[PDB]
Design a protein around this ligand. Structure first.
Ligand SMILES: CCCCCCCC/C=C/CCCCCCCC(=O)O
Ligand SMILES: CCCCCCCC/C=C/CCCCCCCC(=O)O
Ligand SMILES: CCCCCCCC/C=C/CCCCCCCC(=O)O
Ligand SMILES: CCCCCCCC/C=C\CCCCCCCC(=O)O
Ligand SMILES: CCCCCCCC/C=C\CCCCCCCC(=O)O
Ligand SMILES: CCCCCCCC/C=C\CCCCCCCC(=O)O
Ligand SMILES: CCCCCCCC/C=C\CCCCCCCC(=O)O
Ligand SMILES: CCCCCCCC/C=C\CCCCCCCC(=O)O
Ligand SMILES: CCCCCCCC/C=C\CCCCCCCC(=O)O
Ligand SMILES: CCCCCCCC/C=C\CCCCCCCC(=O)O
Ligand SMILES: CCCCCCCC/C=C\CCCCCCCC(=O)O
Ligand SMILES: CCCCCCCC/C=C\CCCCCCCC(=O)O
Ligand SMILES: CCCCCCCC/C=C\CCCCCCCC(=O)O
Ligand SMILES: CCCCCCCCCCCCCCCCCCCC
Ligand SMILES: CCCCCCCCCCCCCCCCCCCC
Ligand SMILES: CCCCCCCCCCCCCCCCCCCC
Ligand SMILES: CCCCCCCCCCCCCCCCCCCC
Ligand SMILES: CCCCCCCCCCCCCCCCCCCC
Ligand SMILES: CCCCCCCCCCCCCCCCCCCC
Ligand SMILES: CCCCCCCCCCCCCCCCCCCC
Ligand SMILES: CCCCCCCCCCCCCCCCCCCC
Ligand SMILES: CCCCCCCCCCCCCCCCCCCC
Ligand SMILES: CCCCCCCCCCCCCCCCCCCC
Ligand SMILES: CCCCCCCCCCCCCCCCCCCC
Ligand SMILES: CCCCCCCCCCCCCCCCCCCC
Ligand SMILES: CCCCCCCCCCCCCCCCCCCC
Ligand SMILES: CCCCCCCCCCCCCCCCCCCC
Lengths: 222, 221, 223
């Protein structure tokens, strides 16, 4: 079942990528870079999840299964999602690349701490986990503070679309660390099959759903 | 023999890099970035191949030359960047198209590494994903990228077409040799594959940049 | 003792990062990018050294301890320090990103050769070490040659600050390969505890000290 679910994920990711490629042919004022980012995210995620389906993207550490291919996915897909969010705030204005790369740096660190926490035992696990949550909070502060102020400087219609996408992404993103802590990597209150289903469903809303909402809004401003 | 060949490769790479550095001192209207790219490719490839000569860049009942993937994950995207900048010479840069090629190429090299560590059908799933990536790269090279080269004039377009055909020919040889050699069907022997992955890279890591830079320098007059 | 020293390092790195964040709030004509770089260097170094304190960032290779977390640190922190130096030379003028990325490329290669030398045995160790020293010499040539000429083109006051920070960084940087060769990774003349102290103290002068000197100088040019 675990294998079949991952094949299904990969096929959905492929269809998402094709959809964004079709939209790119009639761009409606959205620069090509934002279509390219929307295509890379699901293609990369699809390839990582395919490695899990084929039994390669996981190993047995102590008496637990580490799905290490999820970290390979997120270290590329999550910074690209933050870049898409930042470019949405900056649509029709000057780019602030310093703020964009600040988000990328926080995000890569967050994903690495999660990988190290998964390989850790005892208190050390929760030190790494905690550093990642701090990174996520600073990301949320930037998202609803300075980045939202840039979106307001680009006008009411853009600011409203930005706010909608920021809330959408922020809602997903708090679920990941929560699921991690409850599942076998953390306190073990939730079963492996439950965690697998969450980390199949959530990524569909994050790696394809976010880009549908984000690009449709920007296209409607044309 | 395998060790000596790799030392020889590294020394050739060093001479190629020195040559490009000398050309950079009299640039003839070619931006410094294009000389830098031409220097990094052989120096990185040389260092990877040196690790094979010294017995470090491989592990073992099949021998995986993993240092080749370390080489290509840096050297192949830089070759596509040099090709893309050749098309765009004298005109507006399209960095979205350039980064699309880098992304496809890095993916292609990673699939090859995973295919080499894989057994049975799984090997050929990964191999196949890499071939699809390579086909999209060739479509971009002869389609949209060639259209940008045409928009920059007949002389540039002719040089672009020549270097594109040159690189496109090398590049189909790599996956073909991989499949026939010990990583794939095993029809060809280890020593044969070693010689192919010594000779081909000399044409790709030094030869391509001689052809590419000489053409661009000739457009100065 | 080795663990406690690494915890102390990490806490100092955190305080350095907070200091640079505070300076950023009143930037005095220094672009945001230079404050961001000054913050990333100690935060990254802190996290790497924390992994050593917790017993994760090292392993036993035969009869030696490899502190591999140091290379994870330097592969990010050292190119960012060269970027800060290059941006100091280019302050008030056109950026030369080709020269900046030439320094990044040399530096990443230098750190990789060090990691491979540490995993190597016998003559092979000293081949890799040597390639890294050649990279470091080319970096020093660029620093005192073309990069210093760019600093001169941006005025006497900038050029004087550039020269001061370049000498500061150049002194630190020759110490790293010297300590490496004398310690357990090389000739083994110095003991593990000695090398650990050097690779706690030097990084404090490089990962926080450099950025205090560099940013204070640039902020003084606003007045
Ligand atoms: C934790 C790993 C860190 C890796 C990422 C490093 C990020 C630091 C780089 C900073 C680049 C700054 C962006 C360039 C500024 C251009 C001007 C602007 O639009 O603000
Ligand atoms: C698949 C492995 C990892 C690859 C990651 C590559 C990232 C691709 C995203 C880059 C965005 C491109 C930005 C171009 C900006 C300028 C736009 C233009 O003028 O065309
Ligand atoms: C050893 C691994 C090396 C990896 C990094 C190599 C980088 C090579 C690429 C060169 C990019 C140069 C940027 C050119 C921008 C032109 C504008 C300018 O010069 O100011
Ligand atoms: C995205 C593409 C990369 C995905 C990463 C997966 C790495 C897979 C490595 C597999 C090692 C062999 C496992 C086995 O056959 O037992
Ligand atoms: C280790 C892995 C690191 C992966 C990071 C992926 C790259 C991140 C962000 C690049 C996005 C920058 C986009 C700039 C667009 C500029 C524009 O279109 O105006
Ligand atoms: C979740 C926390 C959101 C806090 C938003 C802060 C807005 C003001 C600011 O810090 O600039
Ligand atoms: C929405 C809530 C979903 C989670 C509830 C089911 C948990 C199952 C389990 O703990 O194994
Ligand atoms: C620099 C270019 C990259 C070279 C990297 C590959 C070699 C690194 C591995 C060294 C291990 C030596 C010990 C052994 O395997 O016998
Ligand atoms: C086998 C090689 C396959 C591909 C060759 C190139 C495909 C056609 C070129 C691009 C066509 C175009 O878009 O104009
Ligand atoms: C040019 C083509 C070279 C073909 C060499 C075939 C012999 C290799 C072998 O089967 O061992
Ligand atoms: C951010 C910091 C990155 C550096 C961290 C490296 C830690 C690697 C952890 C490897 C698992 C250690 C196994 C163990 O606990 O014995
Ligand atoms: C390994 C990577 C090494 C490459 C760096 C080559 C140094 C070139 C110096 C000259 C830079 C320039 O072209 O302006
Ligand atoms: C070019 C400059 C490189 C300078 C570096 C010197 C390393 C020399 C090798 C170390 C001494 C030999 C030790 C031994 O063989 O046991
Ligand atoms: C994977 C999604 C499809 C991408 C195909 C691109 C081919 C190049 C088209 C140029 C017009
Ligand atoms: C025993 C397990 C304890 C879990 C600790 C998790 C705390 C939440 C993250 C850290 C937030 C920092 C404030
Ligand atoms: C008006 C200033 C911004 C307030 C943001 C409130 C916090 C949002 C948290 C979202 C998480 C879901
Ligand atoms: C002891 C258990 C403490 C649990 C704390 C609540 C859940 C922590 C994770 C929250 C992740 C999102 C933070 C914004
Ligand atoms: C046994 C460990 C202590 C209980 C921790 C449970 C945390 C539940 C958090 C729920 C938030 C959605
Ligand atoms: C004969 C051996 C030549 C070694 C040259 C050095 C390695 C290539 C450049 C790095
Ligand atoms: C081994 C890495 C170094 C090899 C250098 C190749 C030749 C380039 C010389 C560049 C000197 C620049 C001085 C301004
Ligand atoms: C297994 C040791 C390999 C060290 C070299 C790593 C270089 C990675 C470049 C991407
Ligand atoms: C592991 C991935 C490493 C990829 C190498 C980086 C290639 C990027 C080169 C782009 C140069 C563009 C120059 C613009 C003018
Ligand atoms: C690893 C996934 C890489 C995905 C790159 C997708 C390439 C799409 C084609 C480029 C744009 C064509 C313009 C017409
Ligand atoms: C790995 C550590 C990365 C640290 C990034 C620091 C980001 C802080 C941004 C400050 C706010 C800018 C406005
Ligand atoms: C394999 C590890 C690669 C580490 C590279 C770290 C990033 C180095 C370059 C960042 C600095 C760019 C500064 C541009 C300034 C423009 C203003
Ligand atoms: C054993 C460790 C050796 C490290 C040597 C570090 C370099 C020493 C100084 C030589 C380079 C001088 C560069 C001056 C550039 C003038 C322009
Ligand atoms: C035990 C011996 C400790 C030696 C410390 C050397 C550190 C040099 C720092 C220079 C500032």
């Amino acid at each position: 079942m675990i294998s079949i679910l991952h094949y299904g994920y990969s096929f959905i990711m492929l269809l998402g990528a094709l959809y964004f490629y079709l939209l790119s042919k009639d761009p409606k004022g959205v620069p090509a870079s934002e279509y390219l980012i929307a295509m890379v995210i699901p293609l990369w995620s699809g390839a990582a999840y395919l490695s899990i389906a084929l039994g390669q993207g996981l190993f047995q550490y102590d008496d637990t299964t580490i799905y290490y291919a999820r970290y390979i996915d997120w270290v590329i897909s999550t910074p690209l999602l933050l870049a898409a969010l930042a470019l949405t705030a900056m649509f029709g204005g000057k780019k602030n690349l310093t703020l964009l790369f600040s988000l990328v740096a926080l995000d890569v660190f967050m994903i690495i701490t999660g990988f190290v926490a998964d390989l850790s035992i005892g208190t050390t696990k929760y030190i790494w986990y905690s550093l990642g949550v701090i990174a996520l909070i600073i990301i949320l502060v930037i998202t609803f503070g300075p980045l939202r102020r840039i979106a307001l400087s680009n006008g009411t219609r853009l600011a409203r679309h930005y706010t909608r996408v920021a809330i959408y992404l922020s809602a997903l993103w708090v679920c990941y660390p929560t699921a991690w802590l409850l599942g076998p990597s953390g306190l073990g209150l939730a079963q492996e099959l439950t965690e697998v289903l969450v980390f199949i469903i959530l990524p569909i809303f994050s790696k394809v759903g976010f880009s549908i909402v984000d690009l449709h809004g920007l296209r409607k401003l044309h």
